mmCIF file of C-alpha atoms in Angstrom:
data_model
loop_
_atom_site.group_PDB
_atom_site.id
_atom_site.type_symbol
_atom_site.label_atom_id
_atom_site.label_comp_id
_atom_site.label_asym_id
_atom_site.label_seq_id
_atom_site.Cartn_x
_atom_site.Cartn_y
_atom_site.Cartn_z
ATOM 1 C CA UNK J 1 0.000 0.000 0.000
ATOM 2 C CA UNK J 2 2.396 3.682 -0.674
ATOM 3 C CA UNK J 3 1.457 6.208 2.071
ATOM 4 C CA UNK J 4 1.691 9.339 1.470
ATOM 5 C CA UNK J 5 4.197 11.368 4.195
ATOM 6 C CA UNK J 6 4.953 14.978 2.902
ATOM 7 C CA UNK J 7 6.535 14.812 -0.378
ATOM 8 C CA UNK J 8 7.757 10.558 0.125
ATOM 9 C CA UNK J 9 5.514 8.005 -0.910
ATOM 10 C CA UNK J 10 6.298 4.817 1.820
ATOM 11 C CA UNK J 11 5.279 1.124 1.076
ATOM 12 C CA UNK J 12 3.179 -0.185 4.128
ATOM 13 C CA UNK J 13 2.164 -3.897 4.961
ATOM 14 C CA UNK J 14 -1.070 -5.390 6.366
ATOM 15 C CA UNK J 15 1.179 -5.883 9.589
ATOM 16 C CA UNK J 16 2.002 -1.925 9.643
ATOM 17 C CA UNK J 17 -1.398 -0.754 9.108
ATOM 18 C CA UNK J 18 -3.069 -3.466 11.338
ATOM 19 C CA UNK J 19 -0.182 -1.641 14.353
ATOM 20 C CA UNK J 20 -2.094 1.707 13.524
ATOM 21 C CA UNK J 21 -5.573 0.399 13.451
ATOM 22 C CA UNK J 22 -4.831 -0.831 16.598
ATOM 23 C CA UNK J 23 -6.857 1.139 19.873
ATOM 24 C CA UNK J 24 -9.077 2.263 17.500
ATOM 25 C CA UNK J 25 -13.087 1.342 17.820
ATOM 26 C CA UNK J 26 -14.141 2.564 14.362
ATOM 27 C CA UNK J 27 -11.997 3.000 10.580
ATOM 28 C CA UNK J 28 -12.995 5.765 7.891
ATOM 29 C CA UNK J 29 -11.929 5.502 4.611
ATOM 30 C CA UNK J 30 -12.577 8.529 2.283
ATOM 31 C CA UNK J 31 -12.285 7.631 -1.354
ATOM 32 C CA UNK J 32 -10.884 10.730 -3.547
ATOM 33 C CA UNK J 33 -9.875 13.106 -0.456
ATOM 34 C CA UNK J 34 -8.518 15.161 -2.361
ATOM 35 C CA UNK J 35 -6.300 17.509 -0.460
ATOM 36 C CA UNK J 36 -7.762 15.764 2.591
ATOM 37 C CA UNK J 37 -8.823 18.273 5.069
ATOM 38 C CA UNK J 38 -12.126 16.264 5.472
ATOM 39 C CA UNK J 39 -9.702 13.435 6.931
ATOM 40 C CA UNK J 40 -8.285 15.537 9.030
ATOM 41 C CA UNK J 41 -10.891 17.453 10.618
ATOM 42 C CA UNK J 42 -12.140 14.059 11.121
ATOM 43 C CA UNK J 43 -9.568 12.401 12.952
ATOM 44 C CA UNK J 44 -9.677 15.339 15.217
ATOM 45 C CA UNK J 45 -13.480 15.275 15.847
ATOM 46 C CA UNK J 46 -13.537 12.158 16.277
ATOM 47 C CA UNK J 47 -10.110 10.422 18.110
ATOM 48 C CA UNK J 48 -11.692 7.029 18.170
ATOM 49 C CA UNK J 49 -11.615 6.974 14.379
ATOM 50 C CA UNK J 50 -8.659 5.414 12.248
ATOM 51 C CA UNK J 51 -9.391 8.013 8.919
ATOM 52 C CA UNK J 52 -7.780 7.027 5.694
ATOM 53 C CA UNK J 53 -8.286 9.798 2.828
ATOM 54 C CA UNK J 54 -7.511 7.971 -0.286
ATOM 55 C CA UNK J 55 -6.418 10.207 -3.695
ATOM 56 C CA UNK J 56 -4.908 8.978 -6.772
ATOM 57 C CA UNK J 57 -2.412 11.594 -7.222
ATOM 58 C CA UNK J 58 -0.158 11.627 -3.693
ATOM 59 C CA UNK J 59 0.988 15.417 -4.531
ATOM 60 C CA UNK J 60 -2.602 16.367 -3.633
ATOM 61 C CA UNK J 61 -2.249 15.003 -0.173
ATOM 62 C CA UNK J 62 1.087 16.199 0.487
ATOM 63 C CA UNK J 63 0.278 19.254 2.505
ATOM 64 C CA UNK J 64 -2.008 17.316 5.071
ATOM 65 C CA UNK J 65 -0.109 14.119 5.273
ATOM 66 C CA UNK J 66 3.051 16.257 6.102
ATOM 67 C CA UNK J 67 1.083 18.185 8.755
ATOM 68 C CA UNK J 68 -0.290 15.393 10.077
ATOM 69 C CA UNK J 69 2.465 13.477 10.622
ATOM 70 C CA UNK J 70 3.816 16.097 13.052
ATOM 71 C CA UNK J 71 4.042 15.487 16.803
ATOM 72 C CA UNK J 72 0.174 16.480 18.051
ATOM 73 C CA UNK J 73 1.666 20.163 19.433
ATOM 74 C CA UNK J 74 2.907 20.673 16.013
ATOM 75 C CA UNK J 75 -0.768 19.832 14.582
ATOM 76 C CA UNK J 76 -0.331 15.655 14.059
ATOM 77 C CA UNK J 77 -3.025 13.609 14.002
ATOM 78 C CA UNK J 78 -1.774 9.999 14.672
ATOM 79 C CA UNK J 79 -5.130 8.614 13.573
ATOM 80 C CA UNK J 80 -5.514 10.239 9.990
ATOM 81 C CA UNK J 81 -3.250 8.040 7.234
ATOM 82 C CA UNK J 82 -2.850 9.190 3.428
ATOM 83 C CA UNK J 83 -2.979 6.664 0.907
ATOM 84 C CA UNK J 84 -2.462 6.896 -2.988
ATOM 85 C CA UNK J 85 -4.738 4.893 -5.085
ATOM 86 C CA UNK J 86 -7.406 4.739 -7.874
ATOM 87 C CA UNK J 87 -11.005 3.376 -7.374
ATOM 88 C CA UNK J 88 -10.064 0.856 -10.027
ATOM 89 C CA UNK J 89 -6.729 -0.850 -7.814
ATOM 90 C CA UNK J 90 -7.278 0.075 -4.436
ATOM 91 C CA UNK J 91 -4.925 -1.570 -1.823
ATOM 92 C CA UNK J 92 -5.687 -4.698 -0.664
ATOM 93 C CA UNK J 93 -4.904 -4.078 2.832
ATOM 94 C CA UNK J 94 -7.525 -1.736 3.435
ATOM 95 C CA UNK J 95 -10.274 -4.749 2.211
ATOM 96 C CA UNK J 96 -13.373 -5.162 5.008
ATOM 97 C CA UNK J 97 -11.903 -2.047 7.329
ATOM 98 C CA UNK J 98 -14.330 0.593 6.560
ATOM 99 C CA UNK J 99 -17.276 1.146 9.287
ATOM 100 C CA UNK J 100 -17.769 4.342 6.879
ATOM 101 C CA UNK J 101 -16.846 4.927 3.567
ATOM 102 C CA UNK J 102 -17.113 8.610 2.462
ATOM 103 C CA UNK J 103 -17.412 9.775 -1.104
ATOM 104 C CA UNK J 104 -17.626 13.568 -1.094
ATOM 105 C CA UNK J 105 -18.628 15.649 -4.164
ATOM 106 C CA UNK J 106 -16.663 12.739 -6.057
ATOM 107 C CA UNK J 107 -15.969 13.884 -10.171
ATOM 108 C CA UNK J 108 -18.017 12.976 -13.227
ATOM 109 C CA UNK J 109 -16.893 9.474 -14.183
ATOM 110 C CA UNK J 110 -17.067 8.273 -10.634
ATOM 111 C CA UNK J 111 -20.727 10.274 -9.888
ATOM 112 C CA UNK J 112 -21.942 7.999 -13.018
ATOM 113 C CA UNK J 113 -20.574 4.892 -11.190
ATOM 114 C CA UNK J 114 -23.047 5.528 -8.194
ATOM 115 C CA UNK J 115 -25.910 6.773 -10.150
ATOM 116 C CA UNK J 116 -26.043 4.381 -13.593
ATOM 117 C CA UNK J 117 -24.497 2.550 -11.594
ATOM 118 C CA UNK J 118 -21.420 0.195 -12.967
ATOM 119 C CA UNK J 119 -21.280 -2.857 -11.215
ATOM 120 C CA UNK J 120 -17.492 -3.333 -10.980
ATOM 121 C CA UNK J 121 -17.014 0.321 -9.355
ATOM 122 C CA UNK J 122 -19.482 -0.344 -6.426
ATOM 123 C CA UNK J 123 -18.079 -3.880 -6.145
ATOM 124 C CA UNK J 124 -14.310 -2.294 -5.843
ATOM 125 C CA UNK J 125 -15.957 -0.067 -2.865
ATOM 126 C CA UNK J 126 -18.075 -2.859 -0.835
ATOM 127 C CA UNK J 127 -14.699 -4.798 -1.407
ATOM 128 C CA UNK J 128 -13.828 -1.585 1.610
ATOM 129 C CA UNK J 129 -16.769 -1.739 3.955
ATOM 130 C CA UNK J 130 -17.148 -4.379 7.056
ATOM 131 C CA UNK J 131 -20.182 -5.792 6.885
ATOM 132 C CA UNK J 132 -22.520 -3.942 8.768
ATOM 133 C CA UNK J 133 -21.052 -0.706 7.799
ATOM 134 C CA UNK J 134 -21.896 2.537 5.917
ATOM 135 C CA UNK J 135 -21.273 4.302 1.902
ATOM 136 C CA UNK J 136 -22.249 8.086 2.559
ATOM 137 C CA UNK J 137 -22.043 9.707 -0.764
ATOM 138 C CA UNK J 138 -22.625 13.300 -1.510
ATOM 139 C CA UNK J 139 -23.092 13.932 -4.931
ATOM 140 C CA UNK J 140 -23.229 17.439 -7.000
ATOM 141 C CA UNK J 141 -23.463 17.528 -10.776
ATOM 142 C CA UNK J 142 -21.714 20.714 -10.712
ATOM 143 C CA UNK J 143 -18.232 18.846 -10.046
ATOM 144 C CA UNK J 144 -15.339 18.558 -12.891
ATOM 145 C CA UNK J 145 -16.123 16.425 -15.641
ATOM 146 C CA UNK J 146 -13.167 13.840 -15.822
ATOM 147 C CA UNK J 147 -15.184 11.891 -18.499
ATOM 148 C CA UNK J 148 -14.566 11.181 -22.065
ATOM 149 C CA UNK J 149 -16.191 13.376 -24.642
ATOM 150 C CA UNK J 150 -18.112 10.542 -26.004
ATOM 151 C CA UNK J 151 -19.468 9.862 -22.468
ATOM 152 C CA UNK J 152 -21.419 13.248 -21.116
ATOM 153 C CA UNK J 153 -24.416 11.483 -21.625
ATOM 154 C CA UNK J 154 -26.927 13.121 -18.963
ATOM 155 C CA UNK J 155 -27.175 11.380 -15.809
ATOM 156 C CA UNK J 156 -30.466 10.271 -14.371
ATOM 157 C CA UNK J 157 -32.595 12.108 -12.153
ATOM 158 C CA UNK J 158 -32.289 10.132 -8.476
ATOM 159 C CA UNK J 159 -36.164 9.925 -8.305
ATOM 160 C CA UNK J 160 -37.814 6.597 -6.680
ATOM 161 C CA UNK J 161 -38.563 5.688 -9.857
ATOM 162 C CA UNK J 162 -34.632 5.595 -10.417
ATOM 163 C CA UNK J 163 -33.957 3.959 -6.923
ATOM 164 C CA UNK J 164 -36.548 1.090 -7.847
ATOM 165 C CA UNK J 165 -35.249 -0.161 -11.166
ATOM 166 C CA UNK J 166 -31.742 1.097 -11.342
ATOM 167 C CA UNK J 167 -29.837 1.770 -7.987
ATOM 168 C CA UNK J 168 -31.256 -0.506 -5.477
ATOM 169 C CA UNK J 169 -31.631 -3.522 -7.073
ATOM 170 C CA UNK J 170 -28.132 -2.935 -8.596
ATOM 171 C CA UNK J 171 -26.659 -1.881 -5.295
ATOM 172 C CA UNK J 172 -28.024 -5.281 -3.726
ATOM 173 C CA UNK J 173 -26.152 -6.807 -7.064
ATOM 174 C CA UNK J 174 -22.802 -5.523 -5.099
ATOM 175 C CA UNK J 175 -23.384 -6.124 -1.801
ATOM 176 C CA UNK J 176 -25.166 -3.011 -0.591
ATOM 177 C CA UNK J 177 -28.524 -2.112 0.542
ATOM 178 C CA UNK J 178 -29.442 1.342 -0.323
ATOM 179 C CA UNK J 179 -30.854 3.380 3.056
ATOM 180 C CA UNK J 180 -31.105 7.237 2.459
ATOM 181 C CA UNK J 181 -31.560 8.959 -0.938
ATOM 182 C CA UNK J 182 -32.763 12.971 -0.150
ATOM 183 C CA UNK J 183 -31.904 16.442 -0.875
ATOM 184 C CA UNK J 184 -29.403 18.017 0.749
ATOM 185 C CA UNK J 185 -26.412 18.096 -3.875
ATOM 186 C CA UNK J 186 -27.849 14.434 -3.001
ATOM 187 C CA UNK J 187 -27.423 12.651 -0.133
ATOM 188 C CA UNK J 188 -27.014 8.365 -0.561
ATOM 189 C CA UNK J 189 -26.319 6.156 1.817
ATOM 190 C CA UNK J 190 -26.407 2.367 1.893
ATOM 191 C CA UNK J 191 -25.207 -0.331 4.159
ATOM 192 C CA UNK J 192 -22.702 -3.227 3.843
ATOM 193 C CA UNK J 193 -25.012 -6.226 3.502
ATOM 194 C CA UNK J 194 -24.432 -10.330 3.665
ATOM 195 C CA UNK J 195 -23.991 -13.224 5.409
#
């Protein structure tokens, strides 16, 4: 798995991440953090949180993972980790940790993966969540459109029209039972289903 520390990416194991996990009751992962100051506002609101933000591009995360990192004075947070990875290879190690999974004002391509949906995207995030635990998504139209031309199709309207034949029957497809759709930007929520 490559952390994120400042400007070094660092190869962790299972072993090293399972050392930080432990002490803490619940994990957040945030897929595409960004520059990460949701993660760590998080880990400071809430200390009995392990908080991964998870970015493909490290350099976005430098800034945060460098603070941090820092001795808790000095503005660490020794329960926020950075991690660089795509939706479509995320690190093994982090499989089943989730009790939440964030996805906040996520870009075009991956906003159509929630709301067509595309099987093998929410399969690559259940892959993330304990069972038992929680996908919050927020999701804006107005975010930048990483898509192919060909692709800018319109998305569907979430109405419960929508949720009936498209999302939750496709969510159960994954592993997920969908809880909250509303207004907030949408607000969608489902929970980690099986066994």
């Amino acid at each position: 798995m490559i952390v994120q520390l400042g400007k070094a990416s660092v190869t962790w194991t299972r072993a090293d991440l399972e050392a930080k996990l432990a002490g803490h009751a619940r994990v957040l992962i945030d897929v595409g953090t960004g520059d990460g100051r949701f993660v760590y506002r998080s880990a400071g609101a809430h200390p009995d949180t392990y908080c991964i933000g998870v970015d493909p591009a490290g350099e976005r995360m430098r800034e945060v993972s460098w603070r941090a990192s820092r001795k808790p004075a000095r503005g660490g947070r020794p329960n926020a980790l950075f991690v660089v990875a795509s939706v479509q290879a995320l690190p093994e190690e982090l499989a089943g940790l989730a009790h939440t999974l964030t996805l906040n004002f996520p870009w075009a391509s991956l906003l159509s993966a929630l709301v067509l949906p595309e099987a093998p995207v929410l399969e690559a995030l259940r892959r993330l969540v304990r069972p038992g635990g929680e996908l919050i998504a927020l999701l804006n139209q107005s975010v930048f459109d990483d898509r192919p031309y060909a692709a800018r199709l319109g998305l569907p309207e979430l109405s419960d029209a929508w949720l009936d034949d498209a999302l939750r029957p496709a969510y159960r497809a994954a592993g997920f039972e969908i809880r909250t759709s509303e207004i907030v930007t949408r607000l969608l929520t489902a929970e980690a289903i099986g066994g």
